[PDB]
Structure 1
């Protein structure tokens, strides 16, 4: 976490405005899609196992 703190401190504008926000948005979208797919598959497989 020291590297992250140093980055967010030294580079307040060159990373937060463009890099951090876009990386976080892409990650959150990818994990949301993954969670939705996993939930659908889990529901179908649970119906099958019932």
Structure 2
């Protein structure tokens, strides 16, 4: 966590404005899509196993 703190402290505008926000948005979108797909598969397979 020290590296992240240093990156956020020393670089306040060069990183937070562009690099951090886009990476976080991409990660959250990918994780949401994965969660939706996994939930759909789990429901379908739960009905199948029922």
TM-score, length basis structure 2: 1.00
Q: Which runs of 5+ in 2 are unaligned?
A: none
Residues 3-49 of structure 1: per-residue CA shift (max 9 Å, x gap)? 00000000000000000000000000000000000000000000000
Residues paired across the two proteins, number: 50
TM-score, length basis structure 1: 1.00
The runs of 4+ residues in structure 1 deviating greater than 6 Å are none
